[PDB]
Structures are given as C-alpha cells and as structure tokens.
mmCIF file with all atom_site columns, C-alpha atoms and ligand atoms in Angstrom:
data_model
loop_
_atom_site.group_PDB
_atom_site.id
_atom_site.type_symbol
_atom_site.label_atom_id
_atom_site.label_alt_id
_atom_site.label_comp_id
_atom_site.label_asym_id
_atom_site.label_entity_id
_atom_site.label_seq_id
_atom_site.pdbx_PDB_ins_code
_atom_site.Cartn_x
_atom_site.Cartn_y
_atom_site.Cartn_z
_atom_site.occupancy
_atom_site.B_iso_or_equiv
_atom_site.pdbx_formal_charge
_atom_site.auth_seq_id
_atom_site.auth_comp_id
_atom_site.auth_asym_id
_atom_site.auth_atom_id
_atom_site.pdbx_PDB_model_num
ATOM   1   C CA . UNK A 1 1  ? 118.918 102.146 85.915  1.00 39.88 ? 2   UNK A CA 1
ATOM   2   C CA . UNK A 1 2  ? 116.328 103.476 88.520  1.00 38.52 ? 3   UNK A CA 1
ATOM   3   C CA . UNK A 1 3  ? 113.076 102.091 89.706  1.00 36.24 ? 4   UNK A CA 1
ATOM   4   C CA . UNK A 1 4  ? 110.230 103.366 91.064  1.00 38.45 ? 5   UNK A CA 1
ATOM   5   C CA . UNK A 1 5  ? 110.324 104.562 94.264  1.00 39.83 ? 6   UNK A CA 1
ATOM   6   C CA . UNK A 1 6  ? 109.483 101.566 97.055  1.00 44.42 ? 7   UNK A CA 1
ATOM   7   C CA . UNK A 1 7  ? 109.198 101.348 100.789 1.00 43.90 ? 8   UNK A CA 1
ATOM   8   C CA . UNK A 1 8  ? 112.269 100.986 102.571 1.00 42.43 ? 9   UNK A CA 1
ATOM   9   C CA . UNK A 1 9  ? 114.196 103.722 99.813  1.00 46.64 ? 10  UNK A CA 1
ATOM   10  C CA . UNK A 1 10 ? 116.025 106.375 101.796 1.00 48.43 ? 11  UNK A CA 1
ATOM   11  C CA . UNK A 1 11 ? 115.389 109.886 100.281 1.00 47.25 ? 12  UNK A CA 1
ATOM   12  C CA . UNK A 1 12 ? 115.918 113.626 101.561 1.00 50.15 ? 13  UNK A CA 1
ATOM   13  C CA . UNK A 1 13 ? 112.641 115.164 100.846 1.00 45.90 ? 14  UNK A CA 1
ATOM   14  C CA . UNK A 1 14 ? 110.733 118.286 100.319 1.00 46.64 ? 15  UNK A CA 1
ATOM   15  C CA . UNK A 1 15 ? 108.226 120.523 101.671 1.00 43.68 ? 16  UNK A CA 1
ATOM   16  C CA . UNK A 1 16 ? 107.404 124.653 101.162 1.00 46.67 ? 17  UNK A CA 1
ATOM   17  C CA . UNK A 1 17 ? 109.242 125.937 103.794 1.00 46.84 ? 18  UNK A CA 1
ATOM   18  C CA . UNK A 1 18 ? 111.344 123.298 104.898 1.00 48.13 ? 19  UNK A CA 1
ATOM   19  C CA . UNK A 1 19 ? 114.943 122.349 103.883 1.00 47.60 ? 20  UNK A CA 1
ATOM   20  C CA . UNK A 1 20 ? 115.731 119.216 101.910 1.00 46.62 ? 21  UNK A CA 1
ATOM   21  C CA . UNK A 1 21 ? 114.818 116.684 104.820 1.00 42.22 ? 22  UNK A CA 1
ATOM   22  C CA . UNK A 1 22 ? 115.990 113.187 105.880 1.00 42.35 ? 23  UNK A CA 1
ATOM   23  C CA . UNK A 1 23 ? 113.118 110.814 105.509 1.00 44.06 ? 24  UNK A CA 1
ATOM   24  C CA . UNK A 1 24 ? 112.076 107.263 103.672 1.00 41.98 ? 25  UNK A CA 1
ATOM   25  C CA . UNK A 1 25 ? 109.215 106.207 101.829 1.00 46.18 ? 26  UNK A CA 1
ATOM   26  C CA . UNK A 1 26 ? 107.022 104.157 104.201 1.00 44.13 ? 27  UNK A CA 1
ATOM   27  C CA . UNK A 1 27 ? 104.936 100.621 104.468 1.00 46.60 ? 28  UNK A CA 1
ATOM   28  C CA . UNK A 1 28 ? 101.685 101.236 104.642 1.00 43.71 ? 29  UNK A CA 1
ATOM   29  C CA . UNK A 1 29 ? 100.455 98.973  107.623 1.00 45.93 ? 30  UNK A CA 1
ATOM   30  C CA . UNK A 1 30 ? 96.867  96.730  107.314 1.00 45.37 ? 31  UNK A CA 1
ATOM   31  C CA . UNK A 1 31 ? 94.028  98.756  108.181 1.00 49.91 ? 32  UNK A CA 1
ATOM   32  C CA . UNK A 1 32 ? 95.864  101.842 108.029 1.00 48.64 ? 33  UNK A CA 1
ATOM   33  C CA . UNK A 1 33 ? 95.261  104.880 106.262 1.00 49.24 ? 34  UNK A CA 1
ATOM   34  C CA . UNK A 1 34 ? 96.554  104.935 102.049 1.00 50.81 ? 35  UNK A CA 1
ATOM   35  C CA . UNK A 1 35 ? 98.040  108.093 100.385 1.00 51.50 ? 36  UNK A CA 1
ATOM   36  C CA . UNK A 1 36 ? 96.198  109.718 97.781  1.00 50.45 ? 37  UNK A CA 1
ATOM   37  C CA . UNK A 1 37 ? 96.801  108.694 94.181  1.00 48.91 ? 38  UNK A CA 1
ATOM   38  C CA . UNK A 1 38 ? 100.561 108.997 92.917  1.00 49.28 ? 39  UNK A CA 1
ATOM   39  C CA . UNK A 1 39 ? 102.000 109.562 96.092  1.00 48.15 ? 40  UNK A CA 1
ATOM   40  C CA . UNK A 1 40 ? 103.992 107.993 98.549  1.00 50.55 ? 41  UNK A CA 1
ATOM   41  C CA . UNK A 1 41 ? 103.679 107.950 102.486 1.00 53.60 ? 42  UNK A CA 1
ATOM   42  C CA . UNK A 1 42 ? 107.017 109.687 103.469 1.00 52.97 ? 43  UNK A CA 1
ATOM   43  C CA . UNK A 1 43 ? 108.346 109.099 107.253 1.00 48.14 ? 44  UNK A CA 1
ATOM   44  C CA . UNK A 1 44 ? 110.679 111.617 108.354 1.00 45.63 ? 45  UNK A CA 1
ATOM   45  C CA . UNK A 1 45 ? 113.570 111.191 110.430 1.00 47.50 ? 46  UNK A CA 1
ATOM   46  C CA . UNK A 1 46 ? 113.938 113.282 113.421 1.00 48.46 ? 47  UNK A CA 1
ATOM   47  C CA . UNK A 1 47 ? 110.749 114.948 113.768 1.00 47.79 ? 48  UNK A CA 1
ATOM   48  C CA . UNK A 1 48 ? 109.163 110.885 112.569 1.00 44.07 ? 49  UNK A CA 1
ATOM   49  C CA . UNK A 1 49 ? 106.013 113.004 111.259 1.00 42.84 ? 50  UNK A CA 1
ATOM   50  C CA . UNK A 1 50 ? 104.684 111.921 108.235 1.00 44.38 ? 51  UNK A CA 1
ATOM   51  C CA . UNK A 1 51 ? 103.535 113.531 104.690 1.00 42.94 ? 52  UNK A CA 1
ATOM   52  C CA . UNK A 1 52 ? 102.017 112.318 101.216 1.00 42.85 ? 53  UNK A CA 1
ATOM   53  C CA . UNK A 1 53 ? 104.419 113.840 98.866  1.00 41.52 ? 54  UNK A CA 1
ATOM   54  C CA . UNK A 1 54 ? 104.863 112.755 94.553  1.00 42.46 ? 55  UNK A CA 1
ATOM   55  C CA . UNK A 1 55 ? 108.384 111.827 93.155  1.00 45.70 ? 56  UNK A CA 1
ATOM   56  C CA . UNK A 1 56 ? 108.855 115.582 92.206  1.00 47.51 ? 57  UNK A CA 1
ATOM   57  C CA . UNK A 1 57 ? 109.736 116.554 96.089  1.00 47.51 ? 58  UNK A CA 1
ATOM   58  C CA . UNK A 1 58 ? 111.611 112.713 96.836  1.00 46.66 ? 59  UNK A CA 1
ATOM   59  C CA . UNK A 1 59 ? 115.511 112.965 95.774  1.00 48.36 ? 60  UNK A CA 1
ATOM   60  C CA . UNK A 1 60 ? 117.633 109.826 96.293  1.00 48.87 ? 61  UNK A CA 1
ATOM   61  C CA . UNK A 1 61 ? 119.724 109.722 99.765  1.00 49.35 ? 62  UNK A CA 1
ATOM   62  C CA . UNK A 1 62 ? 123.104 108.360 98.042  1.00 52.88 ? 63  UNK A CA 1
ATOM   63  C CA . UNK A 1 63 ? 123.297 111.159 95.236  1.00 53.49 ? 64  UNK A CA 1
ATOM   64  C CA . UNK A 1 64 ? 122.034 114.244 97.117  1.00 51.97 ? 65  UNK A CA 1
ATOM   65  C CA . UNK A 1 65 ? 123.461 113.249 100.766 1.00 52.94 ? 66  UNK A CA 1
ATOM   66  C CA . UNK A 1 66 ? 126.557 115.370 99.609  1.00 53.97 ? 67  UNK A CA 1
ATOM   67  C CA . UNK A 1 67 ? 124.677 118.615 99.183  1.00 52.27 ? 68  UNK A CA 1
ATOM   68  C CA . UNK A 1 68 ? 121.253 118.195 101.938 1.00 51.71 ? 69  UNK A CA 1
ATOM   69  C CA . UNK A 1 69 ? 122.827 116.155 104.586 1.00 48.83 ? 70  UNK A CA 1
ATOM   70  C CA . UNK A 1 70 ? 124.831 119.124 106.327 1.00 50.37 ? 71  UNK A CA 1
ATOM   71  C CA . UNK A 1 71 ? 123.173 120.190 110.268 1.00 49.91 ? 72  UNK A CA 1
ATOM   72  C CA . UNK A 1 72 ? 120.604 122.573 109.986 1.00 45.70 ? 73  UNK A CA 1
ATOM   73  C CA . UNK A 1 73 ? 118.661 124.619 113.232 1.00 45.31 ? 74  UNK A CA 1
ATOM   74  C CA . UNK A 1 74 ? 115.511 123.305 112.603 1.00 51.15 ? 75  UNK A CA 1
ATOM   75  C CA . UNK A 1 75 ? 113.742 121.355 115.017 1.00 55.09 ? 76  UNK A CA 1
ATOM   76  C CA . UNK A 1 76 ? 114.802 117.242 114.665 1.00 54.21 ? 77  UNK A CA 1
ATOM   77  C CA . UNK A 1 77 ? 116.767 117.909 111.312 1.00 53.27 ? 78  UNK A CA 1
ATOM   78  C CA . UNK A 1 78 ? 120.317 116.836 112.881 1.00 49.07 ? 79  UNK A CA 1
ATOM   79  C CA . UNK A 1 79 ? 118.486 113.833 115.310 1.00 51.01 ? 80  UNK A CA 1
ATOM   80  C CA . UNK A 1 80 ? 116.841 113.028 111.478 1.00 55.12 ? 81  UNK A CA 1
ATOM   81  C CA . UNK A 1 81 ? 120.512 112.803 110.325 1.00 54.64 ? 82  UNK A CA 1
ATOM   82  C CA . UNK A 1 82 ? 120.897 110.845 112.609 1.00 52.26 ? 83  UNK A CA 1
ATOM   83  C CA . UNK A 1 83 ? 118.608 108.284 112.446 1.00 54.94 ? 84  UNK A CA 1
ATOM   84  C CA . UNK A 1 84 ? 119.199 107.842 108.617 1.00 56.07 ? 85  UNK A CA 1
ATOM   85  C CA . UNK A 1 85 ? 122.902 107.380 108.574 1.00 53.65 ? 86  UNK A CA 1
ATOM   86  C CA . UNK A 1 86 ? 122.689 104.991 111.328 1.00 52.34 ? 87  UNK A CA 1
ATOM   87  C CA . UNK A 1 87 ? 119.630 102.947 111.591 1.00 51.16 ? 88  UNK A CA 1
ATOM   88  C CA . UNK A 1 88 ? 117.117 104.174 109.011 1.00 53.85 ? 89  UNK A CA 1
ATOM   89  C CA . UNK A 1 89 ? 115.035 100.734 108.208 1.00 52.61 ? 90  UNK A CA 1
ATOM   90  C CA . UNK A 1 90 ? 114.118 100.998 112.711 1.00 52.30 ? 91  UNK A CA 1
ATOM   91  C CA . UNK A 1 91 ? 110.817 101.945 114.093 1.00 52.10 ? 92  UNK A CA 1
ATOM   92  C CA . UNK A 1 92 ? 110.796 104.914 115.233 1.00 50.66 ? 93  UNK A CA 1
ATOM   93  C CA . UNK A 1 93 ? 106.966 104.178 116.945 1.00 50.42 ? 94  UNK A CA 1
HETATM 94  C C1 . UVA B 2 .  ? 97.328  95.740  111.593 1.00 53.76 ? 101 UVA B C1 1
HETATM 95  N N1 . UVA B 2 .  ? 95.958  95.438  111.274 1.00 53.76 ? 101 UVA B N1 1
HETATM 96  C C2 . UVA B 2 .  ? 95.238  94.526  112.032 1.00 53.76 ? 101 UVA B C2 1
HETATM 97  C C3 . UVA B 2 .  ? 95.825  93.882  113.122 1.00 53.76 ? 101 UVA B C3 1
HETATM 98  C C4 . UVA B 2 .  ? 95.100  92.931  113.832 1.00 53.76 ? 101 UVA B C4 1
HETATM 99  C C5 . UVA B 2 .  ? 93.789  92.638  113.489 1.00 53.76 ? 101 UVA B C5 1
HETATM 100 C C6 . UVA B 2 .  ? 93.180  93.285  112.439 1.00 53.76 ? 101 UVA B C6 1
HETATM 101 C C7 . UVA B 2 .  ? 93.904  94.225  111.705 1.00 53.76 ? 101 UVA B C7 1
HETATM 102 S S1 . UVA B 2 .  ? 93.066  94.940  110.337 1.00 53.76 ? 101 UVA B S1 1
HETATM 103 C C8 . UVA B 2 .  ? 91.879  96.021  111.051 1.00 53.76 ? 101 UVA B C8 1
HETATM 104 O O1 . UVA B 2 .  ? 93.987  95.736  109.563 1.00 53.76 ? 101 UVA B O1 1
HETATM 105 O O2 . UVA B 2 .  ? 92.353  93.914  109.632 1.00 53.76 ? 101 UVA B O2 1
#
C-alpha cells in the first residue's frame, strides 16, 4: 500500500497551464528555504525549476508514465524525460 509522498519519489506533476510534467519531490537542504504547510518542494526535470505543489497535482511516475511520459513541444519537457528515465536521483545544480 502507498505512503506518503518522500524526497527522492519520482512523480509527473501539475501546474495550470502546463502538461503533466516530469519532476521529483525534493530534499530540502540546511538553511534553505521550506515549502508552505502541506506541500512538497517539487524539482522538475528539464526546465530543473522548482514549485510548492500538494499531493492533489503529484501522480506517481510508474503508474502514469504510460499516459504523461510521451514528447511534448514545450520548452525542457523531452530533456525532463530525459533526465527521469535515466538518472533522476542526479543534481541537476
Ligand atoms: C548547507 N547549510 C550550511 C552549510 C555550511 C554552513 C552552514 C550552513 S547553515 C546556514 O544551513 O547552517
């Protein structure tokens, strides 16, 4: 059965506007600025910006890599595809 969500989980993720994206939940380093409440700090592949997003916009990479993990136009997505097929745990600093 499923646990919460941790750093290091691979996820597609999502934002208004944007399609399903290729990201992971992050650390959060010492000294370095904490999400708000509830959420998680998402890194995502390709563009390696990152958001505060809840569980309602975080879908697990394994089950939903079959319908979100197709090339898309937008700037980074296939580089993001990449990156978390092939060596998502990296830094990407
Ligand atoms: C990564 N953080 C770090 C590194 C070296 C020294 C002090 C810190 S801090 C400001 O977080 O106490």
């Amino acid at each position: 059965m499923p646990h919460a969500f941790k750093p290091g989980d691979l996820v597609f993720a999502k934002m208004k506007g944007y399609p399903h994206w290729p990201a992971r939940i992050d650390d959060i380093a010492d000294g370095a600025v904490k999400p708000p409440p509830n959420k998680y700090p998402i890194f995502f592949f390709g563009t390696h910006e990152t958001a505060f997003l809840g569980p309602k916009d975080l879908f697990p990479y394994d089950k939903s890599k079959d319908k979100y993990g197709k090339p898309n136009k937008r700037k980074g997505f296939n580089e993001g595809l990449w990156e978390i097929q092939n060596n998502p745990h990296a830094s990407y600093s």
